[PDB]
Ligand SMILES: OC[C@H]1O[C@@](CO)(O[C@H]2O[C@H](CO)[C@@H](O)[C@H](O)[C@H]2O)[C@@H](O)[C@@H]1O
């Protein structure tokens with residue numbers, strides 16, 4: 001379904017990276033956040049939902065999803081909580097040296113993941129085609 | 136046309152908001168940033184080009200665009216600078232929701248959500264969100 005995303009956390013350099021993947025397409029939105037907390041999680045979900053039609057997010061159901069702030073954020077946005085990360089960590093690696101800050105490396109990796117063409121469409125192309133069609 | 140964005144800065148509560156608009160559709164991406172510097176500007180542009188096909192950005196051509204870091208970022212992402220109202224509507228929505236948000240950044244993101252989801256012209260219309268995917272899908 002075009003409205004389905006998966007959200008997973010990954011850790012590197014003592015920081016926390018949230019990675020949202022649009023399941024149908026492989027398109028990614030990711031951010032380094034200061035700490036894996038409900039407030040930062042709610043905020044990430046709020047940003048994501050304002051940029052793409054998010055209907056359902058599948059999560060790891062952990063501590064940062066149980067609190068008042070995250071439930072509210074999802075409620076407000078109309079969201080229901082009913083491997084790829086390895087490759088992103090690979091890209092972060094090959095570009096890590098080109099930035100002082102991890103956050104910059106992560107965003108370069110997001111750009112690269114979403115633009116890559118391996119018929120032969122990028123994730124960016126796939127997400128737009130899947131959603132346009134739904135509409 | 137589908138790859139053209141405009142980027143302008145807005146100030147509020149002593150902070151700076153960068154607002155990128157997809158000219159063809161009216162869809163927006165916005166962020167409160169630490170300060171209006173080349174580094175933060177480069178980073179905003181890098182995030183933006185990672186998420187939508189940005190070919191050309193129209194900017195205010197100011198100090199934060201003259202530096203080595205922003206030029207590099209644009210070069211890398213493959214972005215072109217060409218020539219130099221919603222920013223007021225967004226101002227409005229932000230005010231309308233400022234109350235329910237602890238931090239300004241939260242208000243801004245609530246305003247982005249609202250701006251991009253709102254139905255233009257009611258029934259049959261199409262939100263900016265819908266318009267942008269429709270424009271870019273068509274281009275492909
Ligand atoms: O997070 C608060 C504030 O920062 C923004 C950009 O201004 O997001 C950035 O925040 C971190 C800065 O250290 C980065 O790790 C993160 O990846 C980056 O996007 C906005 O979302 C928000 O207004």
Ligand SMILES: Cn1nc(N)cc1-c1cc(Br)c2c(c1)OCO2
Pocket residue numbers: 114115116122123124125127128184185186187188271275
């Ligand atoms: C990679 N690529 N090549 C094109 N012709 C268009 C695109 C493209 C890249 C990203 Br990222 C996108 C997108 C399209 O839609 C939303 O996100």
Ligand SMILES: Cn1nc(N)cc1-c1cc(Br)c2c(c1)OCO2
Pocket residue numbers: 049050051052053131135251252253262263264265267268
């Ligand atoms: C508002 N709306 N109503 C729908 N049925 C779909 C959408 C919709 C909302 C946002 Br934001 C989008 C989008 C579609 O494509 C990328 O960003």
Ligand SMILES: [Cl-]
Pocket residue numbers: 007008009036060062064
């Ligand atoms: Cl998580």
Ligand SMILES: [Cl-]
Pocket residue numbers: 142143144171195197199
């Ligand atoms: Cl600016």
